[PDB]
Write a protein that binds this ligand. Structure first.
Ligand SMILES: *[C@H](C)[C@H]1/C(=C/c2[nH]c(/C=C3N=C(/C=C4\NC(=O)C(CC)=C4C)C(C)=C\3CCC(=O)O)c(CCC(=O)O)c2C)NC(=O)[C@@H]1C
Ligand SMILES: *[C@H](C)[C@H]1/C(=C/c2[nH]c(/C=C3N=C(/C=C4\NC(=O)C(CC)=C4C)C(C)=C\3CCC(=O)O)c(CCC(=O)O)c2C)NC(=O)[C@@H]1C
Ligand SMILES: *[C@H](C)[C@H]1/C(=C/c2[nH]c(/C=C3N=C(/C=C4\NC(=O)C(CC)=C4C)C(C)=C\3CCC(=O)O)c(CCC(=O)O)c2C)NC(=O)[C@@H]1C
Ligand SMILES: *[C@H](C)[C@H]1/C(=C/c2[nH]c(/C=C3N=C(/C=C4\NC(=O)C(CC)=C4C)C(C)=C\3CCC(=O)O)c(CCC(=O)O)c2C)NC(=O)[C@@H]1C
Ligand SMILES: *[C@H](C)[C@H]1/C(=C/c2[nH]c(/C=C3N=C(/C=C4\NC(=O)C(CC)=C4C)C(C)=C\3CCC(=O)O)c(CCC(=O)O)c2C)NC(=O)[C@@H]1C
Ligand SMILES: *[C@H](C)[C@H]1/C(=C/c2[nH]c(/C=C3N=C(/C=C4\NC(=O)C(CC)=C4C)C(C)=C\3CCC(=O)O)c(CCC(=O)O)c2C)NC(=O)[C@@H]1C
Ligand SMILES: *[C@H](C)[C@H]1/C(=C/c2[nH]c(/C=C3N=C(/C=C4\NC(=O)C(CC)=C4C)C(C)=C\3CCC(=O)O)c(CCC(=O)O)c2C)NC(=O)[C@@H]1C
Ligand SMILES: *[C@H](C)[C@H]1/C(=C/c2[nH]c(/C=C3N=C(/C=C4\NC(=O)C(CC)=C4C)C(C)=C\3CCC(=O)O)c(CCC(=O)O)c2C)NC(=O)[C@@H]1C
Ligand SMILES: CCC1=C(C)/C(=C/C2=NC(=C\c3[nH]c(/C=C4\NC(=O)[C@H](C)[C@H]4CC)c(C)c3CCC(=O)O)/C(CCC(=O)O)=C2C)NC1=O
Ligand SMILES: CCC1=C(C)/C(=C/C2=NC(=C\c3[nH]c(/C=C4\NC(=O)[C@H](C)[C@H]4CC)c(C)c3CCC(=O)O)/C(CCC(=O)O)=C2C)NC1=O
Lengths: 66, 160, 48, 161, 160, 161, 161, 160, 161, 161, 160
């Protein structure tokens, strides 16, 4: 059940001379198992979670999950 | 704040605060009145601390206020003195907070990049903050002045 | 087929503390002061 | 990721002004309340599992949502629901200890509404359930601490709503 | 311990101990004597706490000592009483140390795995430890009972 | 990792006894000495850079080691050498604060021998350098605290050798 | 990783000859025994935790090892010990199902004695414990499947020893 | 103990304990709890009891503590209080024992010779014990005072 | 001689401290035991002669010791044997009531072994007879009384041998 | 191997100093206790076999170890066990005579744990046996000398652990 | 003797007698008076030491003199006392010599072989010699008894 997510990762830890746009703003497909762990990590990093969609799977399915 | 750091550690391990971490915030809670007192005398004497320390800094390395120095002219010297006031109130925030997280966030990350973009010498900034520390120590009691001095020391180290 | 890092072995320290200089001074003080007379007490000649 | 002290100094920093006597009054009030907050956290932690069990029993159990086709039917979904309530309680006590709602917004409510609607989790039912948690927690921590617990519980309710 | 926890955190941060962390160590050092006395009275009343609390637990949970229960049989009941003695011992260690580090290392980590293999219900174990906390509270003053109660609270919360 | 308190309670735990009166006497002694330890740590933490500077100057400088092909020659290796000296001083003061050398053996001296042999670092020169550190830090913290820093520095020396 | 069939065909593959009648006979023997292998695996899959519990009680409990200072003492160490027994039983059922001990040598017995020596685990006591497991599992699966489980359990013992 | 005295008499008589002697032993068994309670009261009020007794004894015979007296000076007065405390502890032992056997072997055999050698006045010591008896009667129940007074009285008679 | 109460008093006098809580409960244990002790003492006196007769019948009667040349094969020798056994029994009954072995040490077991040896009377024969007397006495006195009487008689037998 | 005097002079030699007043103190203390050490050594030299005999009976006999399958079973292994106890007692008397535990570490406890683990000897059971020896030898030599024997028997126990 | 053993060791290392060894030789010769006196006491009381100690041995170990035992019958018991007599003689020789090499040379090299050939119990012989040592304690003053006791100790220790 891959979740399509859109998120930001502003970082005050350092000022980066190399490219940072790629990591800063991104959309990724995160599987259902990973999403809670990733949600907690990005929320801890303090980035704003702009958007979430259920790219694969169905909103509710008792069995037959991906 | 130490409260913030304790919550962060427990959140990382997905645990409620352990009794020791709870005891830490208890101790800081009782220490709060002392910390507020130290910050209060700093803000009451903010003008005096800034002024004589600034004159001492210019006396120490006059090249800053000499022609060709970054702070040559009354307007330039005024803005640098404004920066000294900025850093002093940063230290007041750190003193009440109990840790250096507010100081770092407000005015440290990228310290070299900011002041070299301005063309200002960071070692000279260090001497200015050192003068502020000395004047602040005079206005603090010796027992209290140890606590404020630690934040000043962190700031000068970060300036370098 | 060998494991370079098999597991990290615990070690039993060779140097026993309470022989270290600071604790040894303190252990001497607590013992000797206990055997000595006790401040702020009415009866002190009775105790063995 | 802020507490009461961080919020006070950051607000003064946004103004650019130095610490004011009114700001220090806010700090004094938080310090005076600090010990009360700490003991509440210990009680919450020890009884956290029981708080969740009692609140779920009084709010969600023996109802249509646990009945088949109700979004908490199936063991996997039931486990996720109780876990989410556990996390709500843990983040609530983090916020209570901090004395600030910043943690709730930064680490809980962000993306929570978007994810819950994406999966169609019944947001009204969750809000009712955490209200049940709120009264159980009020009984355990006491009235004084319960009022502080109440504002952060209601803050989470507002975010879900 | 307070010292070991502070040094762990400072080791991860690669810093000489922060002045605030040293201050906490100072306060722990001064309060150590009160901690030792609290631990002393607990170990002196080891026997009363175990038997009184265990009988409370069996009243609260008659199922465990019933036939078809885990502890039925004087021998099995006695070994559970031993477990209660073990956990009181760990709590006395924790009170002296000042953190949960000894408690969690010695026991209370793989607790669910061990007790699932043994067949005991871990909430029932938690009920027994709660009874121990109540008896210890009665044997302590209100201040002392609060300090010891926190460690008991951590143990029961981890059991659940 | 262990402390004096942690070591005492762990020994009693191995025997399976609640803290005996002898164990309590050890713990009480450590508590009595804790303030002295805290003072000494406050001192050398402030002077850590100076201690490393003096030790390097006294033993490691103006010799073949820091001239072409000497293992301290090259700025990268000079930075690494002074970094190792601050490592040693920082862990030595950790061990002094703890009152136990388990920190040193668990962290500092686990395979440190092997790394230095691989790298080509002269074990003898490192031992000389930390001996100089021991002299400087003993003078700073005083005689009684210095003989406590001294044993931990010598423990590191023995592990290296 | 290998099994009886894979070993037979690999042995013929090295020669490059097609499967001759003796190789076919070995394959026929494995097929003849396969049905009882499947039944035994299903039986001990059902009783996995119970087998471990019985063996632990038989030899590892109410002994000095589980008493303080004995290495099964401490809750973590108890969990690790029963985990290892779970490992051994699961790999024993893998080897029994395959009809080859290659899994045991490949995934269990390589670098196992050295890790146990480093950890301080008594290899003798582990061997005794898995011997008790062998008794319990043999009783559950039956006698002939008990002979088959036994050879692989003995294989594990020999590797540990 | 009373049992010890009866055993000594029986050993001299070369006969098993008499039925009446066993009856008194039974009475001692019955009164063990009451005697222990009285002894606990004396031990609890120990410091105040002998403090008041010392003041009364020095008032009755001021030459014990005056210049040229045996206990002249603070250190010797404290030693006199210790001797009284030795007697008080012996009386508590004897109350627990239910017999004069404990005291007689300690402080009632050769005590006159010892006091004569050191120089302390035997009559004044006896008066001090009497002052203790009055204080104990004040600090104990009426029948508790009677029994405690009886044991005290044997001590006073021994001093004579 | 000594008693249970007297011995605790002696220990407290050695320590130099007034009655402690530990002293209180040791004394209270003697106080509780008193009822059992006195009842048993009355029984022992009532059946004292029968106890001696039963013991020698169980152990030394109708044996070579009674037969000519066995140290008990005279009217005078037999009377002396019964007398010494009665002496041990009476002092043991005393000591059981007292609760302490000081009486037995002071009177019963002083030089007895050396005198028995020089005479030629068998120490082992006396020890066997004492154990037989202990069995008879325990039966007559009762289970709880027999346990205490066993301890005192054990002191006499062990001292003799 | 060292003794108290050799250790004192060796430490002074390492620090390149004539014997200190504190070093002279340690030497005097050893000389004051020396005659007591000599007398104790004579006592347990005479009773060495008896001490081993009692300790074996008091913890190692009529137990699962000496019953079949318990390592001490078999006449070979019984002889080896009692010989090891004689080794421990003899080296304990060496250490007591010397006043230093260096003998124990250098000749007994080096590799002893490793060999016992390889052999399958129970380190816990040997520790229990030598503690039984400690009790017996303390009774024979006396209390003062028994303390001195104990600080070396315990040293052997710790090495075995 | 001490002299011959010192000479033997010096012979092995090829050194003339060291000054300290010469002192020891001189000392032993001078105290030979005390040595002879102790030996004279033992030979004066050869009869009772053997007789009393042997009777104590028989009582302590009845099995040796029982039927089907090594000492059954007056003839065998006479030989047993003869053996104890021989060992006392060796002990007196050893006291005179100042060393145990005469005792070992005569009667401790192969005692197990000889006594096992005879069927005699070696531990029982050791216990008989222990009885002789205990008898010796009364006959010899405390200082003297320690000197003779060591030779008895060697005999019993080799016997076991
Ligand atoms: C300066 C003219 C103005 C200004 C800038 C400002 N920018 C940021 C943060 C980011 N900027 C970028 C942009 C780039 N990243 C890149 O890699 C490249 C090259 C391809 C560009 C142009 C990104 C990604 C960030 C965010 C991540 C980061 O920190 O780098 C900030 C910080 C905002 C914050 O608080 O987190 C600021 C202040 N600010 C001004 O006032 C000017 C008008
Ligand atoms: C019965 C063998 C054991 C037992 C059970 C017991 N269960 C409950 C309550 C609930 N059980 C469930 C279970 C499920 N929900 C699911 O979706 C599925 C899978 C499809 C399962 C298995 C639920 C949801 C509830 C609560 C709400 C509800 O009924 O929907 C109880 C009552 C709890 C109480 O004591 O208050 C009990 C007792 N009890 C036993 O003794 C057995 C060992
Ligand atoms: C319980 C009151 C209701 C309920 C809940 C339910 N939630 C999910 C799934 C998710 N919930 C979250 C939310 C969080 N993740 C976090 O890390 C935190 C802490 C900051 C929160 C609050 C997420 C990310 C998911 C998806 C991934 C996951 O399961 O973890 C489910 C599962 C839905 C499914 O399996 O398809 C359920 C059932 N359900 C109810 O009926 C209650 C009203
Ligand atoms: C000269 C322009 C400035 C200056 C320098 C100064 N340096 C030292 C001492 C040392 N310098 C080095 C440098 C290097 N080591 C390397 O491996 C490399 C790369 C190849 C370099 C550049 C080292 C190792 C030392 C230590 C002493 C030694 O070499 O043994 C000093 C002496 C410092 C002292 O008091 O001891 C000085 C003065 N000083 C100036 O005023 C210039 C601005
Ligand atoms: C107790 C209130 C409940 C209970 C428990 C129960 N436990 C056991 C058996 C064991 N318990 C332990 C526990 C520990 N080992 C540790 O190292 C630590 C930390 C220091 C702990 C707490 C262990 C090892 C055992 C195994 C036996 C042994 O010690 O050798 C039993 C016996 C189980 C059986 O049937 O065999 C019981 C009954 N039972 C209850 O009813 C309570 C709710
Ligand atoms: C139980 C019968 C005995 C026992 C065991 C014990 N084992 C460990 C630790 C480890 N065991 C292993 C072994 C395996 N790892 C595997 O992946 C497999 C299957 C492929 C096996 C067989 C490993 C790697 C470890 C270390 C890592 C870990 O903790 O898992 C311990 C813990 C030791 C410690 O303190 O760290 C214990 C106690 N203990 C006994 O008393 C029994 C005789
Ligand atoms: C027997 C005819 C004679 C005799 C023997 C006696 N033996 C013991 C005690 C033990 N005997 C053994 C023997 C063995 N252990 C072995 O492993 C083997 C080989 C397989 C043998 C033969 C052991 C170990 C003991 C110790 C007790 C135990 O097993 O735990 C006793 C008891 C001694 C005591 O006082 O404790 C006796 C009496 N006794 C006779 O009278 C016979 C002449
Ligand atoms: C007796 C308390 C326990 C016991 C012992 C046992 N030990 C061995 C074998 C050996 N023991 C040693 C130890 C030493 N060697 C030394 O030189 C010294 C002093 C410096 C010591 C302490 C060694 C080397 C061995 C192996 C060689 C040998 O056989 O001598 C065994 C034999 C094991 C085997 O089967 O081969 C035994 C049985 N056994 C017990 O049950 C007790 C707990
Ligand atoms: C050398 C001097 C000497 C004598 C005489 C002696 C006698 C003697 N008689 C005994 C028994 C006995 N003696 C009698 C005696 C009598 N019953 C009667 O009805 C008659 C009136 C009477 C004899 C005519 C009885 C009945 C017993 C057995 C007691 C019993 O066990 O029930 C016993 C105890 C059993 C035994 O021998 O172990 C002894 C020792 N012992 C001695 O050492
Ligand atoms: C400290 C208290 C005390 C003891 C212990 C004691 C013992 C004692 N037992 C003695 C003799 C004796 N004791 C016995 C006793 C026995 N005969 C047996 O068959 C049995 C094995 C054994 C006891 C049941 C015998 C037979 C004699 C010698 C009687 C004689 O022949 O003259 C003697 C010699 C004087 C005499 O003949 O009575 C003494 C002094 N005396 C004491 O004052």
């Amino acid at each position: 059940r891959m979740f399509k997510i859109t998120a930001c990762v502003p970082s005050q830890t350092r000022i980066r001379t190399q490219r940072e746009l790629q990591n800063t703003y991104f959309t990724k497909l995160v599987p259902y198992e990973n999403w809670f762990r990733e949600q907690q990590r990005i929320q801890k990093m303090g980035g704003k979670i702009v958007k979430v969609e259920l790219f694969t799977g169905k909103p509710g399915v008792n069995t037959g999950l991906a | 704040s130490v409260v913030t750091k304790s919550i962060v550690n427990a959140d990382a391990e997905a645990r409620y605060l352990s009794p020791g971490e709870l005891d830490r915030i208890k101790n800081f809670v009782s220490t709060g009145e002392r910390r507020l007192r130290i910050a209060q005398t700093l803000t009451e004497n903010r003008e005096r601390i800034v002024k004589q320390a600034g004159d001492q800094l210019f006396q120490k390395r006059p090249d800053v206020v000499s022609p060709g120095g970054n702070a040559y002219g009354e307007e330039m010297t005024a803005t640098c003195l404004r920066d000294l006031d900025y850093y002093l109130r940063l230290v007041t925030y750190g003193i009440v907070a109990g840790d250096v997280t507010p100081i770092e966030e407000i005015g440290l990350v990228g310290v070299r990049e900011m002041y070299n973009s301005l063309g200002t010498p960071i070692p000279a900034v260090a001497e200015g903050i050192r003068a502020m520390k000395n004047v602040a120590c005079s206005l603090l009691s010796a027992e209290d002045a140890a606590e404020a001095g630690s934040y000043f020391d962190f700031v000068i180290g970060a300036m370098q | 087929d060998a494991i370079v890092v098999p597991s990290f072995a615990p070690v039993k320290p060779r140097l026993d503390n309470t022989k270290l200089p600071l604790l040894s001074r303190a252990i001497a003080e607590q013992e000797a002061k206990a055997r000595q007379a006790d401040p702020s007490k009415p009866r002190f000649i009775e105790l063995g | 990721m802020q507490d009461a002290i961080t919020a006070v100094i950051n607000a003064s920093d946004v103004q650019g002004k130095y610490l004011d006597t009114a700001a220090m009054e806010k700090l004094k009030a938080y310090f005076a309340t600090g010990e009360l907050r700490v003991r509440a956290a210990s009680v919450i932690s020890a009884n956290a599992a029981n708080i969740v069990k009692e609140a779920v029993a009084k709010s969600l159990l023996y109802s249509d949502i646990t009945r088949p086709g109700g979004n908490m039917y199936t063991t996997r979904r039931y486990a996720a629901c109780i876990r989410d309530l556990d996390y709500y309680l843990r983040y609530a006590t983090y916020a209570m200890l901090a004395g600030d709602p910043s943690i709730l917004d930064e680490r809980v409510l962000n993306g929570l509404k978007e994810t819950y609607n994406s999966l169609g989790v019944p947001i009204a039912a969750t809000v009712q359930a955490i209200q049940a948690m709120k009264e159980v927690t009020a009984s355990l921590v006491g009235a004084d601490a319960g009022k502080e617990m109440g504002i952060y519980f209601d803050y989470i309710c507002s975010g879900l709503s």
